[PDB]
Amino acid sequence: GASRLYTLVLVLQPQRVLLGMKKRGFGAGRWNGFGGKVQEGETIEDGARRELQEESGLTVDALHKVGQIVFEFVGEPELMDVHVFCTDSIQGTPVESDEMRPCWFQLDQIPFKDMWPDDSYWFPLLLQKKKFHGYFKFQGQDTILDYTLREVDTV
Numbered sequence: 001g002a003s004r005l006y007t008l009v010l011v012l013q014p015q016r017v018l019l020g021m022k023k024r025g026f027g028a029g030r031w032n033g034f035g036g037k038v039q040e041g042e043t044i045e046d047g048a049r050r051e052l053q054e055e056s057g058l059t060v061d062a063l064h065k066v067g068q069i070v071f072e073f074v075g076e077p078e079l080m081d082v083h084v085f086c087t088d089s090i091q092g093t094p095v096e097s098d099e100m101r102p103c104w105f106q107l108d109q110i111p112f113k114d115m116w117p118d119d120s121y122w123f124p125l126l127l128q129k130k131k132f133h134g135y136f137k138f139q140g141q142d143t144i145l146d147y148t149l150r151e152v153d154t155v
């Protein structure tokens with residue numbers, strides 16, 4: 001039972017994607033999607049919506065399941081079971097929160113050098129609209145020791 005539920009939301013429009021520069025906590029100094037820990041008493045999809053609203057002020061009509069990524073950190077007992085979602089249908093204008101500074105990127109200008117190193121592997125599958133299952137084992141925030149990645153028909 002040693003896994004913890006997380007969400008990660010990508011706002012993907014036909015010619016741009018929304019990311020946020022993380023200002024504090026894990027992944028600070030990287031362009032992240034919007035997400036975090038799923039709480040007691042909410043569904044995974046409601047956690048995804050709650051994280052998106054807290055970090056960007058955005059609400060959404062619909063969120064689509066696009067992937068699952070399991071992260072393992074050496075010395076951390078809980079695996080992080082990240083449910084990844086996509087939306088085109090955003091409600092509102094993204095605004096800066098305490099945690100995140102939102103910015104739109106063109107799909108050929110993805111800032112991979114200032115992103116989590118795992119993004120170079122799985123994020124292209126999200127942009128290519130393929131559903132995926134990923135696993136990445138980290139030693140600290142910079143070093144991938146092992147990984148798996150595949151496409152799936154069901155997230």
Ligand SMILES: CCCCNC(=O)c1ccc(-c2cc3c(Nc4ccccc4)c(C(=O)NC4CC4)cnc3cc2F)cc1F
Nearest residue numbers: 006007008026027031032033035036071082116118119123
């Ligand atoms: C005791 C609890 C553990 C303390 N540390 C953590 O909480 C923690 C450490 C790291 C990560 C983590 C986040 C990632 C991450 N962002 C993320 C993921 C889930 C929830 C929120 C943001 C991305 C991402 O945003 N990619 C861009 C294309 C969209 C990519 N790779 C990631 C790898 C990671 F390992 C998440 C955490 F929650």
